[PDB]
Amino acid sequence: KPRADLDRAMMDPARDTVVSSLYKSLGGALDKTAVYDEEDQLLILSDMETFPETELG
């Protein structure tokens, strides 16, 4: 299993190798994924608008 305390902030990109770059490309050291989407992605909009009634009508 890949090591702990690995992140793409302390690891110098200038010292990258084949395996290290392949690990970065395959989503390794993803400790920055604490962000969530924060979008409902099932929210159907319900902002109905009422048309004003005219005198003709």
Partner 1 sequence: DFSAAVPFLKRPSNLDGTLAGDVGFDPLGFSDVFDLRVLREAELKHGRFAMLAVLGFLVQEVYTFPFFPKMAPVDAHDYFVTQGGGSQIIFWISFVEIFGVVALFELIQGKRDAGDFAFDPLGLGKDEATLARYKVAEIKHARLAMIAIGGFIHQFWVTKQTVLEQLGNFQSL
Partner 2 sequence: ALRTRLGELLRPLNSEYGKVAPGWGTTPIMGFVMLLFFLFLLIILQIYNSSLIIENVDVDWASLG
Partner 3 sequence: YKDGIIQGLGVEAIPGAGRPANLDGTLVGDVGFDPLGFSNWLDLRWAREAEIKHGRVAMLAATGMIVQDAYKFPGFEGEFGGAAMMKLHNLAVEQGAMQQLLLWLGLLEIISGVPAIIQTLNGSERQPGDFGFDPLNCGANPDTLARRQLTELKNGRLAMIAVGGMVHHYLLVGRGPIEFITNIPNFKNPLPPF
23 φ/ψ angles, rounded to the nearest 5 degrees? -70, -40
Which two structure tokens, joined as six digits, stand for 20? Answer: 């290290």
Nearer to partner 3, 16 or 31 (CB): 16
Out of 7, 8, 9, 18, which residue is the one contacting partner 1 (CB under 8 A)?
A: 18
Q: Which two tokens stand for residue 51?
A: 């048309």
Q: Does 26 bind partner 3 (CB under 8 A)?
A: no
The least distance separating partner 2 from the CB of residue 5, rounded to whole angstroms, comes to 19
Q: Which is nearer to partner 1, 15 or 32 (CB)?
A: 15
Spatial distance between the Cα atoms of 21 and 23, rounded to a whole number of angstroms: 5
